[PDB]
Design a protein around this ligand. Structure first.
Ligand SMILES: O=C(Nc1ccc(Cl)cc1)[C@H]1CN(CC(F)(F)F)C[C@@H]1C(=O)Nc1ccc(-n2ccccc2=O)cc1F
Ligand SMILES: [Ca+2]
Ligand code: NA
Lengths: 54, 233
């Protein structure tokens, strides 16, 4: 119910909106069906280290 | 970077390096997208002409993933001045787009209110660069990174011989000999949140490097998120 506790369970951005928690994501991610997770739409989403060889 | 460690493979993929007429690094940048680099406005006055190199980890070794791009447009903040070092921010539009790959990927721009409440409130951020390894030292041929504690604004102001504006924040250590330094300016300060790195600062200035009772001063990116958005339009 609050962004101040585990980021409202959001992977990325959290806001308390119309008095309710809403999650969102950076460009290059799509908010998951569960309304919490951020799913990269491409192989090099922003903010991810390039740790595996493609 | 003074102290810290070499950045491991793939671990600093948003690092860019501004290279002068001579292929010598003088400032960093942060990759924001295929076309845009974030840097410090003050960097623009430190070389007449320059290009941007991405994907580099070792300036003395051709790994094969490096690429050099020319700058098409310089977007300097109109209120930057050398007198104050205030508004120390510039965006670069590249002539040709970056191809994201191993060691080459953008850092995320956060949303302002969340950045202020959740990122700037973290214990530490991460600074990186090819700059000097101690104040009077030579620049690093290997890319380095450093975890730097966020420092209280009141403490920041009291420590400083120069005005600390709301467009600036302090990070680093009081006496511990770790800091950014000459050559790192313009480069990334990023803050990790659940395995995703968000741009939170631009390496800006400091009274020396890693001096006792002085902190690293960084451009407060949360103050410029709308400005960045417009510059990238
Ligand atoms: O780059 C530096 N330090 C550094 C940089 C970033 C971070 Cl995060 C940590 C540390 C030092 C190293 N240089 C010394 C060298 F090269 F020997 F290493 C001078 C440089 C500097 O910034 N001088 C400097 C001092 C003061 C001001 N300043 C600030 C506000 C208003 C006016 C004003 O001039 C501007 C500066 F660039
Ligand atoms: Ca190299
Ligand atoms: Na210090």
């Amino acid at each position: 119910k609050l962004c101040s506790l585990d980021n409202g369970d959001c992977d990325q951005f959290c806001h308390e909106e119309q008095n309710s928690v809403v999650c969102s994501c950076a460009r290059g991610y799509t908010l998951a069906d569960n309304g919490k997770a951020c799913i990269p739409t491409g192989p090099y989403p922003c903010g991810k280290q390039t740790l595996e060889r493609r | 970077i003074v102290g810290g460690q070499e950045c491991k493979d793939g671990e600093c993929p948003w690092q860019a390096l501004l290279i002068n007429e001579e292929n010598e690094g003088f400032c960093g940048g942060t990759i924001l997208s295929e076309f845009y680099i974030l840097t410090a406005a003050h960097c623009l006055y430190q070389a007449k002409r320059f290009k941007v190199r991405v994907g580099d980890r070792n300036t003395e070794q051709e790994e094969g993933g490096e690429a050099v791009h020319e700058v098409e447009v310089v977007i300097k903040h109109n209120r930057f001045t050398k007198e104050t070092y205030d508004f120390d921010i510039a965006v670069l539009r590249l002539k040709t787009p970056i191809t994201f790959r191993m060691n080459v990927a953008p850092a995320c721009l956060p949303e302002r209110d969340w950045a202020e409440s959740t990122l700037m409130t973290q214990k530490t951020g991460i600074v990186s660069g090819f700059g000097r390894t101690h104040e009077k030292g030579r620049q690093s041929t290997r890319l380095k990174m450093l975890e730097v504690p966020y420092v209280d604004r009141n403490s920041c102001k009291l420590s400083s011989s120069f005005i600390i504006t709301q467009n600036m924040f302090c990070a680093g250590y009081d006496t511990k000999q770790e800091d950014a330094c000459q050559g790192d300016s313009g480069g990334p300060h990023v803050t990790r949140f659940k395995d995703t790195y968000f741009v939170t600062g631009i390496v800006s200035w400091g009274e020396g490097c890693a001096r006792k009772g002085k902190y690293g001063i960084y451009t407060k990116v949360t103050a410029f998120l709308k400005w960045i958005d417009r510059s990238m339009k």
